[PDB]
Amino acid sequence: ATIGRISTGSKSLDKLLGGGIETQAITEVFGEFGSGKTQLAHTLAVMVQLPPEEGGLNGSVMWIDTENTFRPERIREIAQNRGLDPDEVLKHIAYARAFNSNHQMLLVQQAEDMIKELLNTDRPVKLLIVDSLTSHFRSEYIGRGALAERQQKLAKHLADLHRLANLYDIAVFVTNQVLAHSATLRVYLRKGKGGKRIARLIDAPLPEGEAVFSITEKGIED
Amino acid sequence: FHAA
């Protein structure tokens, strides 16, 4: 399948990304608390449901939430301000809370069942969010080595996510609060002056430069 | 998973 691209809602961020986040890829956003990672997730969960002429893929969403940060209210706000029916947008997001890192891992296998169900329908899964990818792993496991449980488990988790992205033509979007080179694409996000958010690609020798955007009632915008 |  050709690579599809989901607009972020910001023309600046989209240009930085070459049109939007890609299917058959893991895009990892990382940054400090308050940098807008979860806002970008909420925005993408709406944007992907738009038709391609408006920057979406007419797609469904699956969302694995490890910090209790998914907000249906925020989805409804973004949806109505982007011309969609909030009821429909919520209906096409399949949501699960991950209890711990082991449950988070199992949820990826659970997700595959519904990805297969929807694969040849009018609304296939096009976006899988894991927010936060790493919070449970960092809380539960202390050791840094390749042989340590944290790395072994996270490596398997990331390989599982990769597999889904490429097998089923899905954009996988994950967040990480500040191994490191696993994601197809790493984006560093920070909060700058006047509530502006600034994005930079990390180790992607794609456009040099930085995107700037705002958090608004439309999710994100220039 | 459940609808949101």
Curated annotation (Swiss-Prot), chain A:
Task: Give the domain of life.
Answer: Archaea
Q: Which GO terms describe its molecular function?
A: ATP binding; ATP hydrolysis activity; ATP-dependent DNA damage sensor activity; damaged DNA binding
List the GO biological process terms. DNA recombination; DNA repair
Residues that hold ATP according to the record:
G31, E32, F33, G34, S35, G36, K37, T38
Q: Which UniProt keywords apply?
A: ATP-binding, DNA damage, DNA recombination, DNA-binding, Nucleotide-binding
Q: What does this protein do?
A: Involved in DNA repair and in homologous recombination. Binds and assemble on single-stranded DNA to form a nucleoprotein filament. Hydrolyzes ATP in a ssDNA-dependent manner and promotes DNA strand exchange between homologous DNA molecules.
Protein family per UniProt: Belongs to the eukaryotic RecA-like protein family.
Protein's name in the database: DNA repair and recombination protein RadA
Entire protein: which part is shown? 108 to 349 of 349
